[PDB]
Coordinates of C-alpha atoms and ligand atoms in Angstrom, one line a residue:
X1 CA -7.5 -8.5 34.9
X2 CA -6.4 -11.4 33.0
X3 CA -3.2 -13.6 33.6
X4 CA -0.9 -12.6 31.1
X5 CA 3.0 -11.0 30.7
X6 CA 3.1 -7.6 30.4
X7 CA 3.1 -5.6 27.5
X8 CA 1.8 -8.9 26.0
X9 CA 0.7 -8.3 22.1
X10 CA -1.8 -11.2 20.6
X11 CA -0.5 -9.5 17.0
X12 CA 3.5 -9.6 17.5
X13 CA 4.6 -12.2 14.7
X14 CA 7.5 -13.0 17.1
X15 CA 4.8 -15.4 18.8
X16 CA 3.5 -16.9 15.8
X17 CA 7.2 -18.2 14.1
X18 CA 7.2 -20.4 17.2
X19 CA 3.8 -21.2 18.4
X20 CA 0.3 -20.1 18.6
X21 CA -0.8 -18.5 21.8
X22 CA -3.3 -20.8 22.8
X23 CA -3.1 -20.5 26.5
X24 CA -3.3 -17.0 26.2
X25 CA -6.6 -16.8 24.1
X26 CA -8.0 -19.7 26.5
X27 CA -7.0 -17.4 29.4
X28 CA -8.8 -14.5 27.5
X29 CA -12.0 -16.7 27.4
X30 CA -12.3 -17.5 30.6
X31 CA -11.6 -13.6 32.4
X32 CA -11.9 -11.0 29.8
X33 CA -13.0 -12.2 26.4
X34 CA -13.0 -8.4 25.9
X35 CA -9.6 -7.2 26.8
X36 CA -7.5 -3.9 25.8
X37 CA -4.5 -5.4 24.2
X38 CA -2.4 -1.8 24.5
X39 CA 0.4 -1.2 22.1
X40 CA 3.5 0.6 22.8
X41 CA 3.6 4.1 20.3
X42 CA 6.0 2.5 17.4
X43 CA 5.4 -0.7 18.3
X44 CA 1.2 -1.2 16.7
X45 CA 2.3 -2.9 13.7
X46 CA 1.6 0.0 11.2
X47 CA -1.4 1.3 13.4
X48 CA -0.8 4.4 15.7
X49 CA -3.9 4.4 18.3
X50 CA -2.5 2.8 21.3
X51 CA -4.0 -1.0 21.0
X52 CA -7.0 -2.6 19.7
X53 CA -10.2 -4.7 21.6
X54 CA -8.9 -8.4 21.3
X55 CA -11.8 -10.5 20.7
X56 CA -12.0 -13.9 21.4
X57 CA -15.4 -15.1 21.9
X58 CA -17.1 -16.2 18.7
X59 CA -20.3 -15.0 19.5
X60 CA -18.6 -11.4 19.7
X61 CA -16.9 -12.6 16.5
X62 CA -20.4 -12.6 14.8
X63 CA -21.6 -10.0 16.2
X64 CA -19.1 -7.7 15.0
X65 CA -19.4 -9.5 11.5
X66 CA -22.9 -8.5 11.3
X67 CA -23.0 -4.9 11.9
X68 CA -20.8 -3.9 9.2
X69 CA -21.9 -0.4 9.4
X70 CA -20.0 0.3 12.7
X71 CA -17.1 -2.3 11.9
X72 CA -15.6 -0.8 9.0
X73 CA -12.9 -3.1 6.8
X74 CA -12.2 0.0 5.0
X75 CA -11.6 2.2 7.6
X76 CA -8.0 0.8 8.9
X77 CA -8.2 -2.4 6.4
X78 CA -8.6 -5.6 7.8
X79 CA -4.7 -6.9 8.3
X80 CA -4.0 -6.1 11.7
X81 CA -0.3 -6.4 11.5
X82 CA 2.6 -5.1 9.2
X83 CA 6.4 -3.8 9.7
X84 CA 6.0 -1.3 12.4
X85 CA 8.0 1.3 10.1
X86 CA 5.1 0.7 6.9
X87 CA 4.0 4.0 5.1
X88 CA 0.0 4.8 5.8
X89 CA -0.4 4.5 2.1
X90 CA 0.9 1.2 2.1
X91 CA -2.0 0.1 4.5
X92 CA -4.6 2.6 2.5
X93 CA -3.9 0.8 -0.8
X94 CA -5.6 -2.4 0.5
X95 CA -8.6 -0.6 0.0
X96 CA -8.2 -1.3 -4.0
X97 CA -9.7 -4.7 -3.3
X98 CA -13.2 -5.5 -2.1
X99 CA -12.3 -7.1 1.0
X100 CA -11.2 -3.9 2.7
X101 CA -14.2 -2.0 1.2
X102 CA -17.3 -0.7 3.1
X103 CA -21.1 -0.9 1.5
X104 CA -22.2 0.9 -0.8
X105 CA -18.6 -0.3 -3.2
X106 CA -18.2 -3.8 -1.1
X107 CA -22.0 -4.2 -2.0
X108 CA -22.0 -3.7 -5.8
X109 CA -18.7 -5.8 -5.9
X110 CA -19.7 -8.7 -4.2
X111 CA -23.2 -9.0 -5.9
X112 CA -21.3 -9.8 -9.3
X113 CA -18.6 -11.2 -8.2
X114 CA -20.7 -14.0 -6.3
X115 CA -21.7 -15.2 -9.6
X116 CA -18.2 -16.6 -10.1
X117 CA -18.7 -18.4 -6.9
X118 CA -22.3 -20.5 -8.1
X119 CA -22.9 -24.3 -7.4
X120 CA -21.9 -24.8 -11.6
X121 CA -19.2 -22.9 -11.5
X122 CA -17.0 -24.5 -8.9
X123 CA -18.5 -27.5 -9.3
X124 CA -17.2 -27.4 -12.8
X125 CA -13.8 -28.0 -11.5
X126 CA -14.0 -30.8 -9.3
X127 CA -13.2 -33.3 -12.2
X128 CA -9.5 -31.5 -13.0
X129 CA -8.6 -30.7 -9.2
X130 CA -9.3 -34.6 -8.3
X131 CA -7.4 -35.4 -11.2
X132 CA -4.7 -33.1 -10.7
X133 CA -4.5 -33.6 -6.8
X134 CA -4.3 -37.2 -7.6
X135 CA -1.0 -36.5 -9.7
X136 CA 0.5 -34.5 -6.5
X137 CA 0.2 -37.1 -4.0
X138 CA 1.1 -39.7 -6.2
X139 CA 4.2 -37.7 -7.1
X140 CA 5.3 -36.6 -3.7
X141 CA 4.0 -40.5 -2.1
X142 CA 6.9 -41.5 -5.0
X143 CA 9.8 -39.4 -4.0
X144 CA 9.6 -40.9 -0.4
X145 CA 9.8 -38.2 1.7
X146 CA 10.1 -34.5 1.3
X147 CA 8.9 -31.1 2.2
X148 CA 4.9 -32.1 3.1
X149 CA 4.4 -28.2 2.4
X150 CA 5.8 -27.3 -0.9
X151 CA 5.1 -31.1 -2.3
X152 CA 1.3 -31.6 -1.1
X153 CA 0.0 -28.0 0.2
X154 CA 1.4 -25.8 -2.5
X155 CA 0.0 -26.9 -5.8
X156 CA -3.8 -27.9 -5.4
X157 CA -5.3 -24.2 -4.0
X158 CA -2.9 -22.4 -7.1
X159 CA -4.5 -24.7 -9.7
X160 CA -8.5 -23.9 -8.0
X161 CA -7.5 -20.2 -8.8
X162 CA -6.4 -20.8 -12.3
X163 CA -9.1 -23.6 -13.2
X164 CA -11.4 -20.7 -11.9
X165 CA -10.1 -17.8 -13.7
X166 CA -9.6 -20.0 -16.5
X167 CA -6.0 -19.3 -17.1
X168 CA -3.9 -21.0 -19.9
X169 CA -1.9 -23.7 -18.8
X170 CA 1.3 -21.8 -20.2
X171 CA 0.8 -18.9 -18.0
X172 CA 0.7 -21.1 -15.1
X173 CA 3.7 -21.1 -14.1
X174 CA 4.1 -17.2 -14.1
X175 CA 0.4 -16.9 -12.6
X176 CA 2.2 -19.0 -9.2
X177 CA 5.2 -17.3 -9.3
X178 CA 3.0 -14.0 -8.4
X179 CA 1.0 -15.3 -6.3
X180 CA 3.2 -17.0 -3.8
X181 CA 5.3 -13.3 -3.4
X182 CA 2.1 -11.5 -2.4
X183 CA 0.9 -12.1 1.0
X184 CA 3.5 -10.4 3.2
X185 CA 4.8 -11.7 6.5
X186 CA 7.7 -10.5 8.2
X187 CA 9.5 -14.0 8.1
X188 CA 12.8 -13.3 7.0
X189 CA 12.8 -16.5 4.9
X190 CA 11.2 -14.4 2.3
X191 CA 12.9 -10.8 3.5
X192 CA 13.7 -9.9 0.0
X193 CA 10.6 -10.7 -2.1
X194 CA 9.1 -7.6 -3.0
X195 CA 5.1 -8.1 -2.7
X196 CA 4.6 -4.8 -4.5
X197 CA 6.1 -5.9 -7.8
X198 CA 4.6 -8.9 -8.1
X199 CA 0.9 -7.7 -7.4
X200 CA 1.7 -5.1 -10.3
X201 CA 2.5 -7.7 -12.3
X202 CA -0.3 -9.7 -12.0
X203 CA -3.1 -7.0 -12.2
X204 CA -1.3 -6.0 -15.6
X205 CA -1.7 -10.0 -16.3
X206 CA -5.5 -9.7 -15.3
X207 CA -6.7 -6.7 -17.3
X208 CA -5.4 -7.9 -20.2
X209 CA -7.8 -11.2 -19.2
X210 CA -10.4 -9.1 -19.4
X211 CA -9.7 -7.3 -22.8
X212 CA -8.5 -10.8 -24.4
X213 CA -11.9 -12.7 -23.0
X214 CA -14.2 -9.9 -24.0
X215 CA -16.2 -19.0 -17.9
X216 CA -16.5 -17.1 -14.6
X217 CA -14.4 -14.3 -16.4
X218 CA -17.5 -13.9 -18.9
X219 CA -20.1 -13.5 -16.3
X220 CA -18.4 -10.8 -14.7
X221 CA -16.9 -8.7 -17.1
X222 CA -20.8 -8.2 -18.9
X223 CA -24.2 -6.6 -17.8
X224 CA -25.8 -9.1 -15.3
X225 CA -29.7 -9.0 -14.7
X226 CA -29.6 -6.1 -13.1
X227 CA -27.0 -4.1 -15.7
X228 CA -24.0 -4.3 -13.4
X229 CA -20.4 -5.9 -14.3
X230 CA -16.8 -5.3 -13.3
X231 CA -14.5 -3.1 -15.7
X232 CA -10.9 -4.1 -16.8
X233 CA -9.4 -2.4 -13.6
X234 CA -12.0 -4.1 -11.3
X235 CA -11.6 -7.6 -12.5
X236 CA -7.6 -6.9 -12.4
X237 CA -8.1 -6.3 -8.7
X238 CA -10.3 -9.2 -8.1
X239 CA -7.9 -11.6 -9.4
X240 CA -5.2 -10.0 -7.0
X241 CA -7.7 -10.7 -4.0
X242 CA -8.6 -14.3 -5.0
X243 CA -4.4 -14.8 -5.5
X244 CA -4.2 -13.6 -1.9
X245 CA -7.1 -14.9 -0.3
X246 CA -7.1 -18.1 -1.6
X247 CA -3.9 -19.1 -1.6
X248 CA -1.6 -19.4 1.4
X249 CA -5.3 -20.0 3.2
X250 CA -5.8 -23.3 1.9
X251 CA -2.2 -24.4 1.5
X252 CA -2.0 -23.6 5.4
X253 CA -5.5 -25.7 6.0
X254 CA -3.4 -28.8 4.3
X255 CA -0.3 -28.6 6.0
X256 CA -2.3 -28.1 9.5
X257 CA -4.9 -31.1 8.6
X258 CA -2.3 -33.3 8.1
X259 CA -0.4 -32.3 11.4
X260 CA -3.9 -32.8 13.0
X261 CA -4.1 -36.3 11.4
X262 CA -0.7 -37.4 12.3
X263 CA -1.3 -36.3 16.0
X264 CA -4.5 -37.9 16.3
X265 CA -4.0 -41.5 14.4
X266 CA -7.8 -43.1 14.9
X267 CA -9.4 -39.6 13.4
X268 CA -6.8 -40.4 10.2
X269 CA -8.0 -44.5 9.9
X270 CA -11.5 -43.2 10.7
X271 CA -10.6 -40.9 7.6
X272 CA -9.2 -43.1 5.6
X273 CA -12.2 -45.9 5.5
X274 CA -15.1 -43.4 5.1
X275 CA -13.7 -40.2 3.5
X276 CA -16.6 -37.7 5.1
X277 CA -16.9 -34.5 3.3
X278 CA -17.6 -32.7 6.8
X279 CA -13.9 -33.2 7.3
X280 CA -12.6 -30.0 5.7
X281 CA -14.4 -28.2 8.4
X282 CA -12.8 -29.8 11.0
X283 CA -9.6 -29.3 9.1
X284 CA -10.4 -25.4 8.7
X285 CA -11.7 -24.8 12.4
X286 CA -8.9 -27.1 13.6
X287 CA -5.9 -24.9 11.0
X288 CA -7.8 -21.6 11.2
X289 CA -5.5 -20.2 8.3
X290 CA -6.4 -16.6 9.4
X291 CA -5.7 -15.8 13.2
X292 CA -7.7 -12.7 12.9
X293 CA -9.0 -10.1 11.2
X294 CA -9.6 -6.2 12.4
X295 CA -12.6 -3.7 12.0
X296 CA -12.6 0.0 13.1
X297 CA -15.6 1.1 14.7
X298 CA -17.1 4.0 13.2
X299 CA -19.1 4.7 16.1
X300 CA -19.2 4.2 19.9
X301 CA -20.9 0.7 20.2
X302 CA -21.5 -1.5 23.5
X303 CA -20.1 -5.1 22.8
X304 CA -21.3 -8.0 25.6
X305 CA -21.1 -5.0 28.4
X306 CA -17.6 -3.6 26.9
X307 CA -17.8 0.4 25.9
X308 CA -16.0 0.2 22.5
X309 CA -15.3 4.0 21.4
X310 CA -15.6 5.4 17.5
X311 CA -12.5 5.1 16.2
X312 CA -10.8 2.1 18.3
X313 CA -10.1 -1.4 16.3
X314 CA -11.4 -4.4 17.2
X315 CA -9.1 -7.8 16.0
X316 CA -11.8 -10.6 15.7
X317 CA -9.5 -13.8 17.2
X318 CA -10.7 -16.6 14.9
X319 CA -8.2 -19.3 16.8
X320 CA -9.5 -18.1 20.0
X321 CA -13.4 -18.7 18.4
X322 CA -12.9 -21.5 16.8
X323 CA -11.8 -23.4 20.5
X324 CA -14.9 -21.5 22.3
X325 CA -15.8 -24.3 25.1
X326 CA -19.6 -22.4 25.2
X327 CA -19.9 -23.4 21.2
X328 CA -18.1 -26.6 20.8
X329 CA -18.4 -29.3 22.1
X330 CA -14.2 -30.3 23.4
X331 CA -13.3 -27.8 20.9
X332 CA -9.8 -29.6 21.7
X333 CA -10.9 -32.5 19.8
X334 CA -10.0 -33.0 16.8
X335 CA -13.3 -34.6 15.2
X336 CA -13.9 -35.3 11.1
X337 CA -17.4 -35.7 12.0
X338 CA -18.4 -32.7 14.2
X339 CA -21.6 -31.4 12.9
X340 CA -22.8 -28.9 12.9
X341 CA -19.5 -26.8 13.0
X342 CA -20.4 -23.2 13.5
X343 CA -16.3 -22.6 13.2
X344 CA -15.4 -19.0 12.0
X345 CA -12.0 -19.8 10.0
X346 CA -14.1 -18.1 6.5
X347 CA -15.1 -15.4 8.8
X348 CA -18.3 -14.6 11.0
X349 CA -21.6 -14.5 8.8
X350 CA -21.7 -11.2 7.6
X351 CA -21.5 -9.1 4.5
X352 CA -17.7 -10.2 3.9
X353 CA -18.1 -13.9 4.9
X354 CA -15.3 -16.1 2.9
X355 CA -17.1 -16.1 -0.9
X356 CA -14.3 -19.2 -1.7
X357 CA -15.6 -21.0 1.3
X358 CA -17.0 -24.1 -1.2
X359 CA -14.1 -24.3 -3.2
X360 CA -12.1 -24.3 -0.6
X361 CA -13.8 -26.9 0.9
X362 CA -13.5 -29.0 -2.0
X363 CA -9.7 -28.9 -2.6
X364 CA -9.2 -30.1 0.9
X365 CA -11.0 -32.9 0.8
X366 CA -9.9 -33.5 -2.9
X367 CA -6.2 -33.5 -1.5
X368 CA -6.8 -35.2 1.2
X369 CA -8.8 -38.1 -0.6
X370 CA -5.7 -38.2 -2.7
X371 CA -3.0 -38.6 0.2
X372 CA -5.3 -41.2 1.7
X373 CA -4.9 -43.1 -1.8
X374 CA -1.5 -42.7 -2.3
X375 CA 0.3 -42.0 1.1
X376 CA -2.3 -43.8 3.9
X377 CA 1.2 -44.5 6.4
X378 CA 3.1 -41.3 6.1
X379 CA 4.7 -40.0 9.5
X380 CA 6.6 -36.8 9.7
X381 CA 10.8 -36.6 10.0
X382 CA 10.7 -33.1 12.1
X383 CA 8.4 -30.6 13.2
X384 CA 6.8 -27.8 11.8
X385 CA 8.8 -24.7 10.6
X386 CA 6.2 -21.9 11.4
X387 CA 5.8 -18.7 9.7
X388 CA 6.4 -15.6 11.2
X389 CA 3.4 -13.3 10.9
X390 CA 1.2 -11.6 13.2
X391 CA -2.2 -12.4 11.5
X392 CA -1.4 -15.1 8.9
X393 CA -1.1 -19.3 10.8
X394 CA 1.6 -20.3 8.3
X395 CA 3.8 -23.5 8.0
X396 CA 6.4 -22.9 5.7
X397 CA 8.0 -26.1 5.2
X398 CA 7.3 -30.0 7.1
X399 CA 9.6 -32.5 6.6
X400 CA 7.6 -35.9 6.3
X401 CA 8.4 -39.6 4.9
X402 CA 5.3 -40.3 2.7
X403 CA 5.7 -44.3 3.1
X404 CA 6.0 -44.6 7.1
X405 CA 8.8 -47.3 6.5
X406 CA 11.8 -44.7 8.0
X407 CA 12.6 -44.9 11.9
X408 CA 11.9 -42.1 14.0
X409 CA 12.6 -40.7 17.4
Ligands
LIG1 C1 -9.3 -22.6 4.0 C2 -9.1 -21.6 3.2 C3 -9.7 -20.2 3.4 C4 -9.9 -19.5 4.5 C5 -9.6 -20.0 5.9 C6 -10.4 -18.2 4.1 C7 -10.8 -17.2 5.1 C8 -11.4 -16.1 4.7 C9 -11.8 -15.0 5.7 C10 -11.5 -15.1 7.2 C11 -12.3 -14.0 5.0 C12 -12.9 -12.6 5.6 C13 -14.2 -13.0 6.2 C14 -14.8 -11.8 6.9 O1 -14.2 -10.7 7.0 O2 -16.0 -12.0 7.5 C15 -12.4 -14.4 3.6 C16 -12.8 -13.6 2.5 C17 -12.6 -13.8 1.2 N1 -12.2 -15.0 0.6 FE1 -11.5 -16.6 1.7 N2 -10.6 -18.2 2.8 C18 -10.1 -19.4 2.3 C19 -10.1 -19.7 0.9 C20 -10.5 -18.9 -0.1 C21 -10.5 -19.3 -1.5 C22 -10.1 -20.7 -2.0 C23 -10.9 -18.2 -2.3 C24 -11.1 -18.1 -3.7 C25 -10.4 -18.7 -4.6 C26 -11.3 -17.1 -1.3 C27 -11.8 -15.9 -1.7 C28 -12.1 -14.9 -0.7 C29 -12.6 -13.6 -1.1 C30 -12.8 -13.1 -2.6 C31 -12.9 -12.9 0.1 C32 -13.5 -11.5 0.2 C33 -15.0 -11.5 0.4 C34 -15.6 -10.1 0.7 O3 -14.9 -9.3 1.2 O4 -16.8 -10.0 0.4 N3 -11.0 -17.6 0.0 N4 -11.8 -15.7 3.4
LIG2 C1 -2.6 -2.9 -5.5 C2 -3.0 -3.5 -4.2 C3 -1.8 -4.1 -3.4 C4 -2.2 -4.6 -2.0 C5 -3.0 -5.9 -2.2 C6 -3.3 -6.5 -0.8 O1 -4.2 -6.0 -0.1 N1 -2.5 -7.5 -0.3 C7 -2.3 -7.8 1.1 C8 -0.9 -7.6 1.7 C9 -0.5 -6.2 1.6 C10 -1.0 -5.1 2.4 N2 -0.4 -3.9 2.0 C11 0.3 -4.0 0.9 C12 1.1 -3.1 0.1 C13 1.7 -3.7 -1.0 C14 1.7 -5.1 -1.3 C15 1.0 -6.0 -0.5 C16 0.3 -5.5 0.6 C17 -2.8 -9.2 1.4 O2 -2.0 -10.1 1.1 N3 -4.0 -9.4 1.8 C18 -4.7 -10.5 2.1 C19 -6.0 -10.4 2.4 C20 -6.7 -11.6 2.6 N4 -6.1 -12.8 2.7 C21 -4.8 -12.9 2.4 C22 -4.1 -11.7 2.1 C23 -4.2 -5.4 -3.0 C24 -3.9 -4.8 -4.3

């Protein structure tokens, strides 16, 4: 039995607009990294089995990654928390992109797509993201202080999904706009966007991409080397899943980096001398943008002695794996030079394992090479406004004084 409340829910977002649970998932660790997390009926988040297997050891994290024939994304999706009143449909339409697809459709999918993802082709963007992450900090390092979020976070991961997709810089603007209405929380800062409309929108936007460019876009839309390419529709929906996987992921991983640095000052001058590049992993193991993500298992399947059942979910706990004391060394360290870091914030290895994971890696340390150039003394004003959402570790806004000269508490 482990030592928590009762009725206790590691998915309720009501947790997650305040804090993360982190003594819960230690307490999971250490007596039953395995543990039925039971749901009350109406109360599953959109689900209506009863609970899922929270998993919090990242061994069982890669395990589960791995055998993607029994731990379906498609089955239930991957989200493991909406509204508790959503329509089954509204989960089943997920399915549309490839990250909530099973082999043999996820298989096809990701073998072209993964072309889009090639050493050139993000490398080709390094020289406009430094330039333009240099513009941001110097802009936000100018106005004094500000919202960290929406002045530092925001920009840099929007403009890696444009500069990928090559999109024109007039449709910029528009491109954002969609973007940043489509990951769904319940946070009722954001109540009346409608995610719906704005994913319609924007695959509309993306097929007529395709037509018009018949870069990356190219490669994908044309026979490959072995005759396969995406059509109209299927290059509409992967721009809809690299607007929401790419997005609030990163901007989160900023906001979280620099709370990181500003709670642990020597890592920051360390950072600021020697710029390592094995910082953005720290930043991502240390932010772990997505708390988890769920499979279904399609058949019975014995997991580190634990009798999982066909048909039960399993919620893979990256923030409990990613502070696993039998993996890292004080995972409650913050350290810009751990290495290796096996951290799981793009995912266990496995079929589905993050395909932005360079990229993202890049605009981090792109931003944060910037805000070492043009901010090296900021402090923060107040803390953290979180996000609420029962999967997604969001900071919605950090007030922060970019020169370090105001008083504070
Ligand atoms: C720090 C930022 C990011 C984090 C923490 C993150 C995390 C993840 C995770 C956890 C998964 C699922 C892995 C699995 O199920 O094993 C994933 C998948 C994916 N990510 Fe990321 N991601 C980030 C940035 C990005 C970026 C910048 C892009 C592209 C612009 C991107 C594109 C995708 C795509 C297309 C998938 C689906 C892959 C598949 O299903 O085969 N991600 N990411
Ligand atoms: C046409 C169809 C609409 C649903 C789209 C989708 O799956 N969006 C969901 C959030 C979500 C889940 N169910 C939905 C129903 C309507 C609108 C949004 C959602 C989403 O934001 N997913 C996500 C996955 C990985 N990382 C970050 C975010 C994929 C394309």
């Amino acid at each position: 039995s482990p030592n928590l409340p009762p009725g206790f829910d590691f998915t309720d977002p009501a947790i997650y607009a305040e804090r993360l649970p982190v003594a819960e998932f230690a307490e999971l660790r250490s007596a039953a990294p395995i543990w039925w997390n039971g749901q009350d009926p109406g109360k599953g988040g959109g689900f209506h089995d009863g609970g899922f297997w929270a998993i919090t050891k990242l061994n069982d994290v890669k395990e589960i990654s791995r055998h993607s024939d029994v731990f379906s994304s498609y089955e239930n999706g991957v989200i493991p928390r909406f509204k508790n009143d959503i329509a089954r449909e509204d989960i089943e339409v997920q399915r549309f992109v490839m990250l909530n697809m099973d082999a043999p459709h996820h298989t096809r999918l990701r073998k072209i797509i993964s072309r889009g993802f090639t050493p050139r082709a993000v490398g080709r963007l390094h020289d406009e993201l430094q330039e333009r992450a240099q513009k941001i900090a110097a802009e936000a390092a100018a106005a004094g202080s500000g919202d960290f979020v929406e002045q530092v976070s925001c920009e840099l991961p929007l403009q890696a999904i444009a500069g990928l997709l090559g999109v024109p810089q007039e449709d910029r603007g528009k491109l954002f706009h969609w973007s940043n209405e489509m990951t769904g929380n319940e946070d009722p800062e954001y109540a009346h966007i409608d995610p719906k409309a704005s994913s319609a929108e924007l695959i509309g936007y993306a097929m007529k991409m395709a037509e018009e460019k018949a870069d990356i876009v190219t490669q994908l839309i044309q026979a490959d080397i072995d005759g396969e390419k995406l059509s109209d529709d299927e290059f509409g929906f992967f721009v809809v899943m690299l607007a929401v996987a790419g997005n609030e992921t990163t901007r989160n991983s900023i906001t979280q980096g620099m709370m990181a640095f500003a709670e642990h000052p020597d890592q920051w001058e360390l950072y600021k001398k020697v710029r390592p590049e094995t910082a953005a992993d720290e930043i991502v193991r240390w932010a772990t943008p997505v708390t988890a993500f769920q499979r279904t298992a399609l058949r019975d399947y014995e997991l580190s002695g634990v009798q999982i059942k066909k048909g039960q979910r399993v919620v893979m706990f990256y923030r409990s794996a990613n502070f696993d004391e039998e993996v890292f060394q004080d995972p409650f360290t913050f350290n810009i030079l751990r290495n290796p870091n096996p951290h799981v914030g793009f995912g266990g290895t496995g079929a589905h394992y993050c395909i932005g994971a360079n990229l993202a890696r890049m605009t981090i340390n792109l931003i944060f090479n910037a805000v070492a150039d043009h901010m090296p003394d900021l402090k923060p004003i107040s803390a953290p406004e979180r996000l609420r959402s029962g999967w997604l570790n969001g900071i919605k806004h950090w007030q922060v004084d970019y020169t370090g000269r105001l008083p504070v508490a």
